[PDB]
Amino acid sequence: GVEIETISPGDGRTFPKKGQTCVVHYTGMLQNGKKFDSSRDRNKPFKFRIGKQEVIKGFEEGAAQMSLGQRAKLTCTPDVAYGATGHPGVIPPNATLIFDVELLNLE
Amino acid sequence: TLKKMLPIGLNMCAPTDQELITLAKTRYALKDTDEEVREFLWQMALYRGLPQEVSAVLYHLEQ
Amino acid sequence: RLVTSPGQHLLAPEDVVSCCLDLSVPSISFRINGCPVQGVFEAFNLNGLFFPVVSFSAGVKVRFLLGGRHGEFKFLPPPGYAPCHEAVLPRERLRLEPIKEYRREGPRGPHLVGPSRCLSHTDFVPCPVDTVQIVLPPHLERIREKLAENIHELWALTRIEQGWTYGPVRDDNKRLHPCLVDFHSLPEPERNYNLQMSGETLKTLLALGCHVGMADEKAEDNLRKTKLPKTYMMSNGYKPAPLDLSHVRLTPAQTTLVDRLAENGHNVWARDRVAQGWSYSAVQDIPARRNPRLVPYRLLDEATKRSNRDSLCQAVRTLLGYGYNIERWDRVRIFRAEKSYAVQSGRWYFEFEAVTTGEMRVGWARPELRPDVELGADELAYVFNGHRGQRWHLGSELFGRPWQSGDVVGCMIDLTENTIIFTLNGEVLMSDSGSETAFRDIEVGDGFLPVCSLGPGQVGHLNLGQDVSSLRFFAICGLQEGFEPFAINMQRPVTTWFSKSLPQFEAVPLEHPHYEVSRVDGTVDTPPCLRLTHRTWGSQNSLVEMLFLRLSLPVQFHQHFRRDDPDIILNTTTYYYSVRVFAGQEPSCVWVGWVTPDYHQHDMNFDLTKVRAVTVTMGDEQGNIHSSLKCSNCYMVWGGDFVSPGQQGRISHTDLVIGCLVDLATGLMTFTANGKESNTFFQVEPNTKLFPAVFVLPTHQNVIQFELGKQKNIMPLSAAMFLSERKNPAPQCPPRLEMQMLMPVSWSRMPNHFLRVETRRAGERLGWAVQCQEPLTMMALHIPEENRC
Amino acid sequence: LLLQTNLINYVTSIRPNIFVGRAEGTTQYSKWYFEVMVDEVVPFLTAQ
């Protein structure tokens, strides 16, 4: 599955529910320590709807367990993210992913 | 001999006259007389901040 | 490494962090908001001194709390720990400063700073002359008595001047003292103590090498005593009468002996006090046995030194009254202009200001200047030194005159007449011959650049003339001669490079004077090899010193830990490497093994006890420890462990072969010697990079050979370095694999902008304040195989 | 294989002038303690 560790605590009461839209800031790097993506570089928060297979499984499962304003770290195994095919030219096959996620706003 | 005072004379002429200084320096190369040569006719920013005959001296000292 | 704490979060406002250090059994501990954290550092090296430190980027505000009147603690310190403010030295004052800077902000512009002198942990141990066995000569026994008598008279006079009078029992409020009596009337034990002290002044003079002997036999009967008025008379009839030594004058050597006598006494007293368990502290605590003057004599305050010196000087005058006669490598920093600014024609001028008087040098340099050579010692620079008027180019010559604080030196170069001129405060400096130029007949070559060099503790200012009005002596000398400022008509300030003293690994030059590297192909019975040899072993100009060598490409461990027959060898994941030491090279001076990317020690007295190491231990709330990990940056074995017992030196002419084995799937490293196992082994964490390395000290023409061989059922090193050869069991040495050696210094570029940090004393209760607000960013280029930026 | 590039921040360090060590026959004490308080911090002033 996915492992979640808390960096900065959040509200602790509000959680993402069905039909809502999450606005997050994230940064993703490989297990070796090499960065491959960051939404703060583009200076625009990422927005996605939960339950509509818009993103990979691990990102959604990690974001489902976080409260409003929380900042945490997520780890995803290869069978959850891109499997054995990877992302051509970006992610090699059989890679474990590490994300640093902050939840900003809901809907 | 004693030319420690050459900068004092050089300070008298504005930089704009520099093109003149070489020209007359050629006239003395032709052994012309002084009277004929008299008849024959960021640096600025620093110069303005302060409140001919020289060419003969340089020509003579060139030897 | 992650730790467990109640309410884990990154550092946030209103947080308080307390740090505890125990020198005894190296231990560092932390507490956050009073709740302890479950992890400790331990078993680290102890050489050098420790200091607190805080590191940050832009956008923070913090306060230091050190106890006392420099910030009140918010929590009670552990029972045996002392506040930090007690550690201030007597000669210093508390303040906040950066660490090892090379630049500073000044009134008229930036200042360049040289290396800074620092203390060592061996400066806090007193070392006396230990002249115990010494015994006063028989011929000095009379003067021992007379010296003690006069010292008593002088002592009594001082007491009596300060209102002391006689009484049989000491009373410090009424200032009554029983020793205000004739010397001969003191109790025998007090007389004996005084005689012992007089004798030890004499013995310490002798231990300091003084010659003490009678010179004027008439002097004693010509001595007179000081005649004090009756107001100096005690109730017992005693009035002091010290010798009138007003005619005595210490010679310079005698003054020096007085000065030397005192320090030794203070050092021996301090050692005696330390032997009983006392310690230093900025505040006195008698029950705690801490005294504000328990430091070696060098670190004392001037008043205390003079007070201690006064009595010894008095004794010295008294003794003379009786007619006796008594008789690179972070040591310098170099700054220079960038290569793109080299000039090949024209006439140029620039200025240098000396803020301090000391060892500093200034002049012109070639583009290909070297960073590890003293400035001007070779043909690549033309330099003037002001500490002691000298000119440097391929040697030293007398020139000019010494400078003072605030002096300005103007440097001029003329590439039409090929001359260099130095001026001091507008006056042209000339040599003994009276020549105006310092150097002449200089070949243009590639050009010249401004260069300066600063010694330890020096500060200087450089002006290339971006603003003409900023120059002070340009108009006095240089303007009318047709010289121009170096940086005129430039939009941006000139970029500067400086010498950085951080050792780095670099490839061996193909034309090195002393060392030669050879590549040997593999025969039917031998593998390919890399051999090192010495070129000038027997010549007069031979160079012998330690060598730190490594290979160019690393091996990497996996992310997770869990006659050859092909089935075994296709999935072995174990790799082997070998080193051969030839006969004649002493095996006692060779260390073999692996290094990490962050090894930077250029030590000329290397030993296996100099290796950095630490242990990190994690525990539970109940005191049960979960894990303990050891961290280091060098995994090596010493050749002396494999020498034959009772061997008579290098008499035996036999080669030595040492093999290293690594398992990339379990993290285990082992060693073998001459086909025999060894008891040493190492364990490492996943995702680690290692470089093969050898440390050597040459003692023979042929020194060492790297062997990329192969054992049974074990793949060679080439199968681990290159991806295309992952399944090829044939050893090989591609051209990318080469030997590298450690270098002490290099060149580095100075940034254009620096962070602004403001420090001030926040308050007596608030403590000290640090604040940073303005962000800065840079673009970094990263080399992956060396893990460097 | 190819060289990498990125954007990074500058960092700096600050210390007081207190020095402590240990040796044979030294005159210094062995245990020490100090504290630091945090007033303000911006989690993301830049993208890093």
- Give the phi and the psi of residue C268 in degrees, each rounded to 5: -70, -35
Q: Cβ separation of C87 and D25 shorter than 8 Å?
A: no
**Beta carbons within 8 Å of C361's beta carbon, 6+ residues apart:** C375, C376, C383, C384, C385, C392, C452, C453
Q: How was this structure determined?
A: cryo-EM
Helix (H, G, I), strand (E, B) or coil at C322: coil
Continuous segment of H or E residues that includes residue C188: helix C188-207
Nearest CA in chain C to A6: C9
Q: Cβ separation of D47 and A35 shorter than 8 Å?
A: no
For C98, the closest of D14, D25, D46 (CB atoms) is D14
Q: Cβ separation of C775 and D32 shorter than 8 Å?
A: no
Give CA angle at C218 (C217, C222), nearest 5°. Answer: 140
Residues of C in contact with B10 (CB under 8 A): 480
**Beta carbons within 8 Å of C648's beta carbon, 6+ residues apart:** none
Residues of C in contact with B11 (CB under 8 A): 480
Residue with tokens 């801490």: C290
Q: How far does C36 lie from chain A, in Å, by closest CA?
A: 19
| Among the listed residues C387, C340, C348, C386, the one whose alpha carbon sits nearest the alpha carbon of residue C364 | C348
CB–CB of C664/C555 below 8 Å? yes
Residue C270, Cα to own-chain centre: how many angstroms? 26
Residue with tokens 């107001």: C231
C646: left (phi over 0), alpha (psi -120 to 50) or beta: left
Instruction: Inform me whether the C-beta atom of residue C723 falls under 8 Å from chain D C-beta atoms.
Output: no
Cβ contact D–C (≥3 pairs, < 8 Å): yes
Describe the crossing of helices C188-207 and C302-321 by its angle, rounded to 10 degrees: 90
CB–CB of D36/C65 below 8 Å? yes
Instruction: Inform me whether the C-beta atom of residue C21 falls under 8 Å from chain B C-beta atoms.
Output: no
For A38, the closest of D4, D43, D47 (CB atoms) is D47
How far is the C-alpha of C113 from the C-alpha of C132, rounded, in Å?
Answer: 47
How far is the C-alpha of A72 from the C-alpha of A74, rounded, in Å?
Answer: 7
For C10, the closest of A7, A32, A96 (CB atoms) is A7
Helix (H, G, I), strand (E, B) or coil at C255: helix
Residue with tokens 């340099």: C365
Choosing from A4, A46, A48, A56, the catalytic residue is A56
Kindly tell me the burial class for residue C575, based on how many C-beta atoms sit within 10 Å of its own C-beta (0-12, 13-18, 19 or more).
Answer: buried
Residues of A in contact with D4 (CB under 8 A): 34
Residues of B in contact with C480 (CB under 8 A): 6-7, 10-11
Residue C367, Cα to own-chain centre: how many angstroms? 31
CA pseudo-torsion sign C263, C266, C269, C270: negative
For A32, the closest of C2, C12, C687 (CB atoms) is C687
**Beta carbons within 8 Å of C350's beta carbon, 6+ residues apart:** C410, C411, C450, C462, C463, C464, C465, C485, C486, C487
User: Is A26 considered catalytic here?
Assistant: yes
CA atoms within 13 A on the CB side of A74: 28
Q: Cβ separation of B7 and C480 shorter than 8 Å?
A: yes
CB–CB of C703/C582 below 8 Å? yes
CB–CB of C786/C90 below 8 Å? no
Instruction: Inform me whether the C-beta atom of residue A94 falls under 8 Å from chain C C-beta atoms.
Output: no
Amino acid in the structure at residue C689: K
When scoring C47, C50, C100 by the number of chain D Cβ atoms within 10 A, the one with the most, hence best to mutate, is C50
How far is the C-alpha of D26 from the C-alpha of C274, rounded, in Å?
Answer: 8
**Given the DSSP bridges, would you call strands C103-104 and C634-638 parallel, antiparallel or unpaired?**
unpaired
Kindly tell me the burial class for residue C242, based on how many C-beta atoms sit within 10 Å of its own C-beta (0-12, 13-18, 19 or more).
Answer: buried
**Beta carbons within 8 Å of C774's beta carbon, 6+ residues apart:** C58, C755, C756
Residues of A in contact with C8 (CB under 8 A): 6
Greatest C-alpha distance within chain B: 38
Burial code (b: 16+ CB inside 10 Å, e: under 16) for C692-704 equals bbbbbbbbeebbb
Q: Cβ separation of D41 and C12 shorter than 8 Å?
A: yes
Q: How far does A40 lie from chain D, in Å, by closest CA?
A: 5
What the block records as the tokens of C12 is: 């946030």
| Among the listed residues C297, C295, C294, the one whose alpha carbon sits nearest the alpha carbon of residue C259 | C297
C28, β-bridge pairs: C21, C41
What the block records as the tokens of C694 is: 């050898």
Q: How far does A6 lie from chain C, in Å, by closest CA?
A: 7
Helix (H, G, I), strand (E, B) or coil at C594: strand
Nearest CA in chain B to C480: B7
When scoring D6, D22, D34, D38 by the number of chain C Cβ atoms within 10 A, the one with the most, hence best to mutate, is D34
For A9, the closest of C2, C9, C687 (CB atoms) is C9
Continuous segment of H or E residues that includes residue A27: strand A21-30
Q: Cβ separation of C488 and B7 shorter than 8 Å?
A: no
CB–CB of C115/C333 below 8 Å? yes
Beta strand residue intervals within C33-87, DSSP E? 35-36, 39-42, 54-56, 60-65, 82-83
CB–CB of C447/C344 below 8 Å? yes
Residues in chain B, total? 63
Kindly tell me the burial class for residue A85, based on how many C-beta atoms sit within 10 Å of its own C-beta (0-12, 13-18, 19 or more).
Answer: exposed
Three-state SS string over C399-429 comes to CCCCCCCCCEEEEEEECCCCEEEEEECCEEC
- Give the phi and the psi of residue C18 in degrees, each rounded to 5: -115, 130
Instruction: Inform me whether the C-beta atom of residue B46 falls under 8 Å from chain C C-beta atoms.
Output: yes
Helix (H, G, I), strand (E, B) or coil at B36: helix
Three-state SS string over C727-780 comes to CCCCCCCCCCCCEEEEECCEEEECCCCCCCEEEEEEECCCEEEEEECCCCEEEE
Residue C247, Cα to own-chain centre: how many angstroms? 48
Describe the crossing of helices C302-321 and C252-275 by its angle, rounded to 10 degrees: 120
Choosing from A37, A46, A50, A100, the catalytic residue is A37
Residues of C in contact with D17 (CB under 8 A): 51, 88, 92, 94-95, 97
Task: Give the count of beta carbons closer than 10 Å to the beta carbon of residue C323.
Answer: 18
**Given the DSSP bridges, would you call strands D12-16 and C777-782 parallel, antiparallel or unpaired?**
unpaired
Residues of B in contact with C488 (CB under 8 A): 42
Instruction: Inform me whether the C-beta atom of residue C778 falls under 8 Å from chain D C-beta atoms.
Output: yes
CA pseudo-torsion sign C210, C212, C216, C220: positive
What the block records as the tokens of C62 is: 């913090």
Residues of B in contact with C475 (CB under 8 A): 46
User: Is A99 considered catalytic here?
Assistant: yes
CB–CB of C719/C575 below 8 Å? yes
User: Is A36 considered catalytic here?
Assistant: yes
